[PDB]
């Protein structure tokens, strides 16, 4: 029975082996997603996003006419974009170019077509009656994007728009109970419960969640953990998040709460190096300045042979730009050799930097043949600390 608990968690299954065994469960799980419905709603949200950008630009006095060329800074200064929001402002122009309203050569911008009248809020409500199931996303897009000009002009701290004290959950319902998040979060749970199904009765398991928010992904895991054999450290950079979560999860008695900034050495923050079996980071690692230093801090927490579970969006999204792209974390990135103009990585980029930062046996999920395109826009990545 008893082997020494000081020795590494050799009992953990391999991510590839976990992926193999869950494969039939995933082929049934991804068909529960509506191919057309989540595709329809995705396209329309990208069209709505344009409306919000045009609405916001006009409210700042945008007066540029077709053929006219302007400089990015000059336009920012004209419309009153505060200096810290010009990165976001550039991306909003890049989006107008994708749809043909603007064109870009050099760092100069030329108007192609005059933008027409928009009422994105009237159209938002239409979408809400059509698709009440994505109400969290439209409500949050409404609160953040219908205030874009306030944000670009620095009159609103976007934190109060995305994560105000009186409402941290709306941003979590997006991460937790959207159609796609339900699939991805179930994978996170099934992966974690499969990886540990060989845990000796003699040994406890230690999990640590980075950037856990108010527990969007956490809530999928906790119902399956064995309180007698588990320690679960709920961390976030913000104390308001851990405090709301402690309220939500108060009757799970095996939970620890603590604050962690994954951009600074976790050992300087009260965390033991290389003594966590499983690290969860859902939708957080991208929001840092250097993925290599961030992933090296993550690696520093993992026991030899321990498991990282990552949940990340992998594609550009205009409606996401109008919510989380308002925040500092979205544009923190400075590792331009890897991330030239957007904080997110695709599946192949994530595998690459993970192998460079001391991980192996990297799996990306789901990978099912006829799955919805929307399942290719997000991924669960499982990787093993390379002993």
Ligand X SMILES: Nc1ncnc2c1ncn2[C@@H]1O[C@H](CSCC[C@H](N)C(=O)O)[C@@H](O)[C@H]1O
Give binding residues as ranges. Answer: 172, 214-217, 236, 261-263
Q: Which of 18, 141, 287, 326 binds ligand X (CB under 6 A)?
A: 287
- Do 82 and 153 touch, CB atoms closer than 8 A? yes
Q: Which of 127, 222, 282, 372 binds ligand X (CB under 6 A)?
A: 282
Closest separation between CB of residue 263 and ligand X, Å? Answer: 5
Name residues whose C-beta falls within 8 Å of residue 302's C-beta, 6 or more positions apart in sequence. Answer: 274, 276, 277, 279, 308, 385
Q: Which residues of 179-200 are buried (b: 16+ CB within 10 A; e: fewer)?
A: bbbebbbbbbbbbbebbbeebe
> Can you tell me the distance from the alpha carbon of 122 to that of 385, in angstroms, rounded to the nearest whole number?
50
Residue closer to ligand X by CB (options 54, 375) is 375
217 binds ligand X (CB under 6 A): yes
381 binds ligand X (CB under 6 A): no
Closest separation between CB of residue 160 and ligand X, Å? Answer: 14
Q: Which of 9, 213, 305, 325 binds ligand X (CB under 6 A)?
A: 213
Q: Which residues of 356-382 are buried (b: 16+ CB within 10 A; e: fewer)?
A: ebbbebbbbbbeeeebbebbebbbbbb
How crowded is the C-beta side of 197, counted as CA atoms within 13 Å?
A: 12
Number of residue whose CB is nearest ligand X: 216
Give, as ranges, the residues between 109 and 128 that touch ligand X (CB under 6 A): none
Residue closer to ligand X by CB (options 115, 298) is 298
- Do 14 and 384 touch, CB atoms closer than 8 A? yes
Q: Which of 56, 211, 266, 325 binds ligand X (CB under 6 A)?
A: 211
Residue closer to ligand X by CB (options 115, 309) is 309
Q: Which of 44, 137, 288, 378 binds ligand X (CB under 6 A)?
A: 288
Cis peptide before 366 (omega within 30 of 0): yes
Residue closer to ligand X by CB (options 158, 213) is 213
Residue closer to ligand X by CB (options 7, 264) is 264
172 binds ligand X (CB under 6 A): yes
9 binds ligand X (CB under 6 A): no
Give, as ranges, the residues between 321 and 360 that touch ligand X (CB under 6 A): 329
219 binds ligand X (CB under 6 A): no
Give, as ranges, the residues between 229 and 268 that touch ligand X (CB under 6 A): 236-238, 241, 260-263
Q: How many residues bind ligand X (CB under 6 A)?
A: 24
Residues placed in the known binding site for S-adenosyl-L-homocysteine? 172, 214-217, 236, 261-263
Altogether, the residues listed in the chain come to a count of 387
Q: Which of 52, 109, 131, 175 binds ligand X (CB under 6 A)?
A: 175
Closest separation between CB of residue 281 and ligand X, Å? Answer: 8
How crowded is the C-beta side of 357, counted as CA atoms within 13 Å?
A: 22
- Separation in Å, CA 164 to CA 156, 161, 224, 248: 11, 6, 31, 17
Closest separation between CB of residue 279 and ligand X, Å? Answer: 12
Provide the binding-site residues for ligand X, judged by CB under 6 A.
172, 175, 210-217, 236-238, 241, 260-263, 282-284, 287-288, 329
């Amino acid at each position: 029975y008893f082997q020494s608990n000081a020795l590494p968690p050799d009992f953990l299954l391999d991510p590839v082996e976990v992926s193999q065994q869950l494969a039939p469960s995933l082929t049934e799980l991804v068909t529960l997603l509506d191919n057309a419905r989540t595709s329809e709603i995705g396209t329309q949200l990208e069209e709505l996003s344009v409306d919000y950008i045009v609405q916001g630009l006009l409210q700042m006095g945008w007066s540029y006419q077709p053929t006219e060329s302007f400089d990015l800074d000059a336009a920012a200064q004209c419309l009153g974009v505060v200096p810290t929001q010009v990165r976001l402002f550039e991306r909003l122009l890049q989006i107008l170019a994708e749809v043909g309203i603007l064109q870009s050569n050099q760092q100069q911008w030329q108007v192609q077509k005059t933008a027409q009248k928009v009422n994105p809020s009237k159209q938002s409500q239409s979408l809400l009656s059509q698709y009440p199931d994505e109400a969290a996303t439209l409500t949050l897009l409404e609160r953040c994007a219908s205030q874009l000009s306030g944000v670009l002009r620095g009159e609103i701290d976007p934190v109060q728009l995305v994560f105000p004290q009186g409402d941290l959950t709306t941003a979590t319902q997006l991460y937790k109970d959207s159609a796609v998040a339900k699939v991805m979060n179930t994978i996170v749970e099934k992966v974690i419960m499969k990886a540990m199904e060989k845990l000796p009765p003699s040994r406890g398991i230690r999990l640590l969640e980075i950037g856990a928010g108010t527990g969007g992904t956490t809530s999928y895991i906790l119902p399956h953990l064995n309180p007698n054999q588990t320690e679960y450290i709920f961390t976030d950079i913000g104390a308001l998040f851990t405090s709301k979560a402690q309220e939500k999860f108060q009757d799970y008695r095996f939970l620890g709460y603590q604050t962690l900034d994954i951009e600074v050495d976790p050992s300087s923050q009260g965390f033991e190096s290389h003594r966590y079996d499983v690290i969860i980071a859902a939708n957080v690692l991208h929001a840092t300045t250097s993925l290599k230093q961030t992933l090296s801090h993550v690696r520093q927490l993992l026991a030899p042979g321990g498991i990282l579970v990552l949940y990340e969006a992998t594609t550009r999204s205009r409606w996401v730009d109008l919510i989380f792209g308002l925040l500092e974390g979205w544009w923190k990135f400075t590792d331009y050799e890897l991330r030239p103009d957007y904080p997110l990585l695709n599946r192949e980029q994530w595998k690459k930097v993970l192998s460079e930062t001391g991980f192996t046996q990297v799996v990306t999920l789901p990978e099912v043949e006829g799955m919805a395109e929307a399942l290719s826009q997000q991924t669960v990545i499982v990787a093993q600390a390379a002993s």
